[PDB]
Amino acid sequence: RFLKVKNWETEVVLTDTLHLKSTLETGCTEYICMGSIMHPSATKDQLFPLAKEFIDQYYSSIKRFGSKAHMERLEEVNKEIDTTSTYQLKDTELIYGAKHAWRNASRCVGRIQWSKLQVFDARDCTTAHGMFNYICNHVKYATNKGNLRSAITIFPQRTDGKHDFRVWNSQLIRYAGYKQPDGSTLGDPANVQFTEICIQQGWKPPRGRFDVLPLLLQANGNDPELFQIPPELVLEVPIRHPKFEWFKDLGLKWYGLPAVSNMLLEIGGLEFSACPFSGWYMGTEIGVRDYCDNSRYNILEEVAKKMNLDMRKTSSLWKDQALVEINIAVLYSFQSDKVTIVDHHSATESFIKHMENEYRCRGGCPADWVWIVPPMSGSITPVFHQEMLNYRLTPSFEYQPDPWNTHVW
Amino acid sequence: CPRFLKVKNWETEVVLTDTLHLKSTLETGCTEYICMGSIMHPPEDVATKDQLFPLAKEFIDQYYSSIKRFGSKAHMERLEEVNKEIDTTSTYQLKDTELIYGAKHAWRNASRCVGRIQWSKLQVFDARDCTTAHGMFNYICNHVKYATNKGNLRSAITIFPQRTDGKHDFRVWNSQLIRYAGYKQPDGSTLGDPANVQFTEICIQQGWKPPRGRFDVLPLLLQANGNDPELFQIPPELVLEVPIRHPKFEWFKDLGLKWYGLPAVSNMLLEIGGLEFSACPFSGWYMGTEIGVRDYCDNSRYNILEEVAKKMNLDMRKTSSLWKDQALVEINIAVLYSFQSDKVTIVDHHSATESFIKHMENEYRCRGGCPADWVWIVPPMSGSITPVFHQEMLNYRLTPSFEYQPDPWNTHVWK
Ligand code: HEM
Ligand code: HEM
Ligand SMILES: CNCc1ccc(-c2cncc(CCc3cc(C)cc(N)n3)c2)cc1
Ligand SMILES: CNCc1ccc(-c2cncc(CCc3cc(C)cc(N)n3)c2)cc1
Ligand SMILES: C[C@H](O)[C@H](O)[C@H]1CNc2nc(N)[nH]c(=O)c2N1
Ligand SMILES: C[C@H](O)[C@H](O)[C@H]1CNc2nc(N)[nH]c(=O)c2N1
Ligand SMILES: [Zn+2]
């Protein structure tokens, strides 16, 4: 059936037809909704229909469905799955597939940009040194001296599952975290385990509060190897406040490049287990989650001190006041340093515009309200009031197991 | 369906196990292929004899389980008596004990409510003997007075007679017992609460003389036994109101804001053992953000961010200055301060969400789960600095329950 989504602020109703194209499960049933669950629950035989479906939609998008090129491609893929139990994507198909995995990513508020994605083909890579080279070039290109550019680098697909390419870092650029003798934690507490895996592999930690982790790279199922990203490639921003001159003395910094490296890109039944991709930050990612999550850098109490706020009762909203100032600082700092960043008002506004675009030209836009609504000031952004439908379209970005749980050394 | 479902808290790493979902009784709107978790709402006839039997037995079984008398002589007798009632009259009547149990559990089961730690402390007023709109008015006035308690709010529900053939419904036409009027002007501006223009126009048609002010309490529009609804003014002394001021900004009181103390939902349907109570107004107390963020700062509501931003002398040219967010916090500080100062019960969103987590954990432990709607439970400001943001939740529908129902002006057959 045709499903309707309403905006309760504008009373705009949109009609979703696109959902009729899904086949992958959401996790929900008619009786139980798993909308807030973060991670809900090949062979030649399985591979061809998937390949067939992807090839069909590719030639549908370039308006040549049933064409000779289309027919020959379908035949081509058949013989190759037949004789090798896999197949290789054409360049045009790789690029199409990567852009549409982004386009279909229901948890991403940045998708108005989806067709502007620089795709780096790294499928000829064979070694960790090779991966390091490709990743360094990605970082340099994407960073672009502050004028950030969306990019994805795609390493060889899975074959037998014993020769996977993996970036072991969850993101390309992150700060180390150290368990202190006295029980506390220096740096990013979320990364303590990974940091210690790096130390155990020979990494000499500076034991500072913002130490860029090394890359840990696995090529063709081999033991991973360590590499330091050259520092001039790692763009960082000191955080200061436009009114509070004491804010710089907190000693805060962050990296300019958000780059997810632990996901799996699926295209036409092929699995790309190493596909680091990057964009630019929304301010709240740093200001709210990275800095103020209790399990992260956790700086609210400190900032509240310097603001001289009364912190005895929660109903003074002292946390809320500190939160807003921290996020003002982050936006101000990046902007002052000419580093691309978007505030959550601008981003969610762009997303509503994007949704409208997709409903008109595509018949829908899969979207995960739980992830799209920002972690602060939710209802004064327009996505809070926007009904969204969530469903799974392929090509897609999927989660995969942590490498350190499925790798025989 | 799997017998055990796990939910994780991503801040504390606490994992909880849900078995209660197995008792799910009707549908969420989601399917295997689409999730409607952010959809707000995903024939004038009634339940037949055959439909009512299993629904009644299900509820009676559950009641006698709760009082540790499952399988008792009293249990088997009640089943038999209920079965006879449905067989001869094609409906049945709940005992007072069962009515109270059912109401408390409809609240316990309400997946969109963050205040459920309080669910067993609910004063139930049995108004099933009511026959006229004047009588409904008396019952509602007593509810308001009891629940308000001079500012020491007490949660309460008043239950009017159940549905019979569908042509004799009791309805409160008001969506909430206490709301402010909205007035659309010829030039397109709105006075008062813009959300309430439609209902306000209905009241005016029915004979209400409008003060045409910014905070005019609407009259009750009460429908008894399927008759045309009738208008009543709640005695102003029963409507507790709080003027909004700010502990630091002396100019904040100059905005002339106030709000009412008692949040009371009156447009929902209470379903117990297959019986349908189409008029069941219930009330609790406010969480500050309901007023401070939604009523005051929604663009479609009172929309005061701009005016407050100006008085705060904020740079309002770039959104990236977060002037809106800064004003939002100050407005919500003002609301909590004004309620506390006047000793009217209110809870801040930090306290409420912390209590809810403790509640949820206790429910998983004693009941095997706690259905919760994340989209509704997480507050409309500062989401991730509240613990519920990081809590995975399962949403499913248990009965007894509160359900939505059509607006009565859309369905009513005028006499
Ligand atoms: C260009 C600017 C972009 C912006 C402003 C943006 C914004 C965001 C934000 C705020 C999130 C939530 C992140 C979190 O809470 O962990 C997110 C998630 C996500 N983004 Fe985007 N993004 C951008 C680019 C991209 C690109 C280039 C891709 C892929 C080619 C992408 C794919 C995804 C995916 C798959 C997620 C979900 C991640 C997960 O499930 O953990 N995004 N995005
Ligand atoms: C006692 C203090 C209570 C608190 C602090 C509280 C808190 C809340 C809040 C903040 C909401 C969201 C309302 C909205 O955004 O429109 C809500 C919804 C709800 N509450 Fe509670 N509540 C309380 C009492 C009650 C009682 C006494 C009942 C019923 C007996 C109840 C049943 C419900 C229901 C059914 C909803 C969903 C309303 C809808 O779908 O529009 N609550 N509650
Ligand atoms: C439970 N949460 C654990 C967690 C903690 C941190 C991160 C994370 C760390 N560093 C960077 C990110 C970037 C997310 C992102 C990706 C992209 C492409 C754009 C963007 N704005 N933001 C995410 C992810 C997950
Ligand atoms: C689409 N949203 C429209 C809408 C607008 C206003 C209201 C509303 C108006 N006045 C009062 C409320 C109270 C909701 C509530 C009920 C209860 C029992 C407790 C509580 N804290 N809050 C809700 C509900 C819905
Ligand atoms: C579209 C979305 O479902 C809608 O705006 C919801 C979001 N969450 C909410 N949460 C609460 N408590 N109250 C609401 O009215 C809403 N509105
Ligand atoms: C339990 C819940 O699903 C989890 O905390 C989610 C909520 N929404 C989120 N939204 C974004 N953008 N990122 C997140 O990590 C989360 N975490
Ligand atoms: Zn769902």
mmCIF file with all atom_site columns, N, CA, C and O in Angstrom, chain B residues 55-82:
data_model
loop_
_atom_site.group_PDB
_atom_site.id
_atom_site.type_symbol
_atom_site.label_atom_id
_atom_site.label_alt_id
_atom_site.label_comp_id
_atom_site.label_asym_id
_atom_site.label_entity_id
_atom_site.label_seq_id
_atom_site.pdbx_PDB_ins_code
_atom_site.Cartn_x
_atom_site.Cartn_y
_atom_site.Cartn_z
_atom_site.occupancy
_atom_site.B_iso_or_equiv
_atom_site.pdbx_formal_charge
_atom_site.auth_seq_id
_atom_site.auth_comp_id
_atom_site.auth_asym_id
_atom_site.auth_atom_id
_atom_site.pdbx_PDB_model_num
ATOM 1   N N  . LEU B 1 55 ? -11.576 -12.120 25.270 1.00 0.00 ? 55 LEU B N  1
ATOM 2   C CA . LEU B 1 55 ? -10.996 -10.897 25.823 1.00 0.00 ? 55 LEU B CA 1
ATOM 3   C C  . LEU B 1 55 ? -11.290 -10.756 27.318 1.00 0.00 ? 55 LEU B C  1
ATOM 4   O O  . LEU B 1 55 ? -10.428 -10.321 28.090 1.00 0.00 ? 55 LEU B O  1
ATOM 5   N N  . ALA B 1 56 ? -12.509 -11.110 27.717 1.00 0.00 ? 56 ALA B N  1
ATOM 6   C CA . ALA B 1 56 ? -12.894 -11.038 29.127 1.00 0.00 ? 56 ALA B CA 1
ATOM 7   C C  . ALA B 1 56 ? -12.124 -12.069 29.952 1.00 0.00 ? 56 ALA B C  1
ATOM 8   O O  . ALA B 1 56 ? -11.552 -11.742 30.990 1.00 0.00 ? 56 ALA B O  1
ATOM 9   N N  . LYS B 1 57 ? -12.099 -13.309 29.474 1.00 0.00 ? 57 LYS B N  1
ATOM 10  C CA . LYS B 1 57 ? -11.370 -14.378 30.151 1.00 0.00 ? 57 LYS B CA 1
ATOM 11  C C  . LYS B 1 57 ? -9.899  -14.029 30.334 1.00 0.00 ? 57 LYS B C  1
ATOM 12  O O  . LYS B 1 57 ? -9.327  -14.292 31.391 1.00 0.00 ? 57 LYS B O  1
ATOM 13  N N  . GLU B 1 58 ? -9.299  -13.435 29.305 1.00 0.00 ? 58 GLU B N  1
ATOM 14  C CA . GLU B 1 58 ? -7.895  -13.048 29.339 1.00 0.00 ? 58 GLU B CA 1
ATOM 15  C C  . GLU B 1 58 ? -7.668  -12.059 30.479 1.00 0.00 ? 58 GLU B C  1
ATOM 16  O O  . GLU B 1 58 ? -6.714  -12.189 31.244 1.00 0.00 ? 58 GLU B O  1
ATOM 17  N N  . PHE B 1 59 ? -8.558  -11.077 30.600 1.00 0.00 ? 59 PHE B N  1
ATOM 18  C CA . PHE B 1 59 ? -8.400  -10.070 31.636 1.00 0.00 ? 59 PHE B CA 1
ATOM 19  C C  . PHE B 1 59 ? -8.704  -10.632 33.032 1.00 0.00 ? 59 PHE B C  1
ATOM 20  O O  . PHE B 1 59 ? -7.988  -10.344 33.996 1.00 0.00 ? 59 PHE B O  1
ATOM 21  N N  . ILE B 1 60 ? -9.755  -11.438 33.143 1.00 0.00 ? 60 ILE B N  1
ATOM 22  C CA . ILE B 1 60 ? -10.125 -11.988 34.439 1.00 0.00 ? 60 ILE B CA 1
ATOM 23  C C  . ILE B 1 60 ? -9.011  -12.910 34.954 1.00 0.00 ? 60 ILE B C  1
ATOM 24  O O  . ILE B 1 60 ? -8.657  -12.866 36.134 1.00 0.00 ? 60 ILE B O  1
ATOM 25  N N  . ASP B 1 61 ? -8.455  -13.729 34.059 1.00 0.00 ? 61 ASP B N  1
ATOM 26  C CA . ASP B 1 61 ? -7.328  -14.603 34.390 1.00 0.00 ? 61 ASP B CA 1
ATOM 27  C C  . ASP B 1 61 ? -6.152  -13.795 34.925 1.00 0.00 ? 61 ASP B C  1
ATOM 28  O O  . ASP B 1 61 ? -5.523  -14.153 35.909 1.00 0.00 ? 61 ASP B O  1
ATOM 29  N N  . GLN B 1 62 ? -5.880  -12.686 34.267 1.00 0.00 ? 62 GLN B N  1
ATOM 30  C CA . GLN B 1 62 ? -4.778  -11.823 34.635 1.00 0.00 ? 62 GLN B CA 1
ATOM 31  C C  . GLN B 1 62 ? -5.036  -11.183 36.011 1.00 0.00 ? 62 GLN B C  1
ATOM 32  O O  . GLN B 1 62 ? -4.135  -11.107 36.844 1.00 0.00 ? 62 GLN B O  1
ATOM 33  N N  . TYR B 1 63 ? -6.267  -10.740 36.255 1.00 0.00 ? 63 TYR B N  1
ATOM 34  C CA . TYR B 1 63 ? -6.613  -10.166 37.561 1.00 0.00 ? 63 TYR B CA 1
ATOM 35  C C  . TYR B 1 63 ? -6.424  -11.163 38.714 1.00 0.00 ? 63 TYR B C  1
ATOM 36  O O  . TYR B 1 63 ? -5.795  -10.844 39.725 1.00 0.00 ? 63 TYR B O  1
ATOM 37  N N  . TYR B 1 64 ? -6.972  -12.363 38.557 1.00 0.00 ? 64 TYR B N  1
ATOM 38  C CA . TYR B 1 64 ? -6.852  -13.392 39.585 1.00 0.00 ? 64 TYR B CA 1
ATOM 39  C C  . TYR B 1 64 ? -5.426  -13.915 39.752 1.00 0.00 ? 64 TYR B C  1
ATOM 40  O O  . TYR B 1 64 ? -5.059  -14.383 40.825 1.00 0.00 ? 64 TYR B O  1
ATOM 41  N N  . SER B 1 65 ? -4.612  -13.806 38.710 1.00 0.00 ? 65 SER B N  1
ATOM 42  C CA . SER B 1 65 ? -3.185  -14.048 38.876 1.00 0.00 ? 65 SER B CA 1
ATOM 43  C C  . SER B 1 65 ? -2.544  -13.001 39.779 1.00 0.00 ? 65 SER B C  1
ATOM 44  O O  . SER B 1 65 ? -1.737  -13.336 40.644 1.00 0.00 ? 65 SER B O  1
ATOM 45  N N  . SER B 1 66 ? -2.917  -11.737 39.582 1.00 0.00 ? 66 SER B N  1
ATOM 46  C CA . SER B 1 66 ? -2.289  -10.632 40.303 1.00 0.00 ? 66 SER B CA 1
ATOM 47  C C  . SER B 1 66 ? -2.546  -10.689 41.809 1.00 0.00 ? 66 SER B C  1
ATOM 48  O O  . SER B 1 66 ? -1.726  -10.228 42.597 1.00 0.00 ? 66 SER B O  1
ATOM 49  N N  . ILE B 1 67 ? -3.685  -11.248 42.203 1.00 0.00 ? 67 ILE B N  1
ATOM 50  C CA . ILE B 1 67 ? -4.042  -11.335 43.617 1.00 0.00 ? 67 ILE B CA 1
ATOM 51  C C  . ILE B 1 67 ? -3.776  -12.730 44.199 1.00 0.00 ? 67 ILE B C  1
ATOM 52  O O  . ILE B 1 67 ? -4.282  -13.075 45.264 1.00 0.00 ? 67 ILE B O  1
ATOM 53  N N  . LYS B 1 68 ? -2.972  -13.513 43.486 1.00 0.00 ? 68 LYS B N  1
ATOM 54  C CA . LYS B 1 68 ? -2.557  -14.847 43.923 1.00 0.00 ? 68 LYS B CA 1
ATOM 55  C C  . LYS B 1 68 ? -3.740  -15.768 44.191 1.00 0.00 ? 68 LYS B C  1
ATOM 56  O O  . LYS B 1 68 ? -3.752  -16.499 45.182 1.00 0.00 ? 68 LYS B O  1
ATOM 57  N N  . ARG B 1 69 ? -4.739  -15.726 43.314 1.00 0.00 ? 69 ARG B N  1
ATOM 58  C CA . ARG B 1 69 ? -5.900  -16.599 43.452 1.00 0.00 ? 69 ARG B CA 1
ATOM 59  C C  . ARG B 1 69 ? -6.236  -17.281 42.133 1.00 0.00 ? 69 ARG B C  1
ATOM 60  O O  . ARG B 1 69 ? -7.377  -17.658 41.899 1.00 0.00 ? 69 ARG B O  1
ATOM 61  N N  . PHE B 1 70 ? -5.242  -17.424 41.263 1.00 0.00 ? 70 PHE B N  1
ATOM 62  C CA . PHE B 1 70 ? -5.455  -18.096 39.985 1.00 0.00 ? 70 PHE B CA 1
ATOM 63  C C  . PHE B 1 70 ? -5.911  -19.540 40.213 1.00 0.00 ? 70 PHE B C  1
ATOM 64  O O  . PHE B 1 70 ? -5.271  -20.293 40.951 1.00 0.00 ? 70 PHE B O  1
ATOM 65  N N  . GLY B 1 71 ? -7.026  -19.913 39.592 1.00 0.00 ? 71 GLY B N  1
ATOM 66  C CA . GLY B 1 71 ? -7.528  -21.273 39.691 1.00 0.00 ? 71 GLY B CA 1
ATOM 67  C C  . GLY B 1 71 ? -8.412  -21.495 40.906 1.00 0.00 ? 71 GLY B C  1
ATOM 68  O O  . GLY B 1 71 ? -8.901  -22.601 41.135 1.00 0.00 ? 71 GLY B O  1
ATOM 69  N N  . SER B 1 72 ? -8.620  -20.443 41.689 1.00 0.00 ? 72 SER B N  1
ATOM 70  C CA . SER B 1 72 ? -9.441  -20.538 42.892 1.00 0.00 ? 72 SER B CA 1
ATOM 71  C C  . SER B 1 72 ? -10.923 -20.653 42.563 1.00 0.00 ? 72 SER B C  1
ATOM 72  O O  . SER B 1 72 ? -11.352 -20.392 41.440 1.00 0.00 ? 72 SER B O  1
ATOM 73  N N  . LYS B 1 73 ? -11.698 -21.042 43.563 1.00 0.00 ? 73 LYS B N  1
ATOM 74  C CA . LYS B 1 73 ? -13.143 -21.099 43.441 1.00 0.00 ? 73 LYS B CA 1
ATOM 75  C C  . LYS B 1 73 ? -13.718 -19.739 43.033 1.00 0.00 ? 73 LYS B C  1
ATOM 76  O O  . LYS B 1 73 ? -14.593 -19.652 42.171 1.00 0.00 ? 73 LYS B O  1
ATOM 77  N N  . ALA B 1 74 ? -13.209 -18.676 43.645 1.00 0.00 ? 74 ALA B N  1
ATOM 78  C CA . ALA B 1 74 ? -13.642 -17.333 43.302 1.00 0.00 ? 74 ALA B CA 1
ATOM 79  C C  . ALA B 1 74 ? -13.289 -16.995 41.845 1.00 0.00 ? 74 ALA B C  1
ATOM 80  O O  . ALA B 1 74 ? -14.060 -16.327 41.155 1.00 0.00 ? 74 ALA B O  1
ATOM 81  N N  . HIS B 1 75 ? -12.134 -17.464 41.383 1.00 0.00 ? 75 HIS B N  1
ATOM 82  C CA . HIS B 1 75 ? -11.710 -17.231 40.002 1.00 0.00 ? 75 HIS B CA 1
ATOM 83  C C  . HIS B 1 75 ? -12.673 -17.924 39.037 1.00 0.00 ? 75 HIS B C  1
ATOM 84  O O  . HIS B 1 75 ? -13.237 -17.286 38.147 1.00 0.00 ? 75 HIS B O  1
ATOM 85  N N  . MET B 1 76 ? -12.880 -19.224 39.234 1.00 0.00 ? 76 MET B N  1
ATOM 86  C CA . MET B 1 76 ? -13.751 -20.009 38.355 1.00 0.00 ? 76 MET B CA 1
ATOM 87  C C  . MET B 1 76 ? -15.203 -19.524 38.361 1.00 0.00 ? 76 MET B C  1
ATOM 88  O O  . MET B 1 76 ? -15.880 -19.577 37.331 1.00 0.00 ? 76 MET B O  1
ATOM 89  N N  . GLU B 1 77 ? -15.676 -19.062 39.516 1.00 0.00 ? 77 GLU B N  1
ATOM 90  C CA . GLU B 1 77 ? -17.018 -18.508 39.622 1.00 0.00 ? 77 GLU B CA 1
ATOM 91  C C  . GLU B 1 77 ? -17.169 -17.203 38.839 1.00 0.00 ? 77 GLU B C  1
ATOM 92  O O  . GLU B 1 77 ? -18.179 -16.981 38.172 1.00 0.00 ? 77 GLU B O  1
ATOM 93  N N  . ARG B 1 78 ? -16.172 -16.333 38.942 1.00 0.00 ? 78 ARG B N  1
ATOM 94  C CA . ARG B 1 78 ? -16.208 -15.057 38.242 1.00 0.00 ? 78 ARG B CA 1
ATOM 95  C C  . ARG B 1 78 ? -16.196 -15.259 36.724 1.00 0.00 ? 78 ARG B C  1
ATOM 96  O O  . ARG B 1 78 ? -16.891 -14.555 35.990 1.00 0.00 ? 78 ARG B O  1
ATOM 97  N N  . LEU B 1 79 ? -15.403 -16.217 36.257 1.00 0.00 ? 79 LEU B N  1
ATOM 98  C CA . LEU B 1 79 ? -15.367 -16.566 34.839 1.00 0.00 ? 79 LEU B CA 1
ATOM 99  C C  . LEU B 1 79 ? -16.770 -16.965 34.370 1.00 0.00 ? 79 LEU B C  1
ATOM 100 O O  . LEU B 1 79 ? -17.238 -16.553 33.306 1.00 0.00 ? 79 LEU B O  1
ATOM 101 N N  . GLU B 1 80 ? -17.430 -17.772 35.189 1.00 0.00 ? 80 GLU B N  1
ATOM 102 C CA . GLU B 1 80 ? -18.740 -18.328 34.869 1.00 0.00 ? 80 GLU B CA 1
ATOM 103 C C  . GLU B 1 80 ? -19.823 -17.254 34.855 1.00 0.00 ? 80 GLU B C  1
ATOM 104 O O  . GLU B 1 80 ? -20.686 -17.231 33.974 1.00 0.00 ? 80 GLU B O  1
ATOM 105 N N  . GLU B 1 81 ? -19.771 -16.378 35.851 1.00 0.00 ? 81 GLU B N  1
ATOM 106 C CA . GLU B 1 81 ? -20.694 -15.261 35.957 1.00 0.00 ? 81 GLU B CA 1
ATOM 107 C C  . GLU B 1 81 ? -20.523 -14.288 34.782 1.00 0.00 ? 81 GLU B C  1
ATOM 108 O O  . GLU B 1 81 ? -21.505 -13.827 34.203 1.00 0.00 ? 81 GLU B O  1
ATOM 109 N N  . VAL B 1 82 ? -19.272 -13.992 34.427 1.00 0.00 ? 82 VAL B N  1
ATOM 110 C CA . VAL B 1 82 ? -18.984 -13.101 33.307 1.00 0.00 ? 82 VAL B CA 1
ATOM 111 C C  . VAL B 1 82 ? -19.481 -13.705 31.994 1.00 0.00 ? 82 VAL B C  1
ATOM 112 O O  . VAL B 1 82 ? -20.066 -13.014 31.159 1.00 0.00 ? 82 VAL B O  1
#
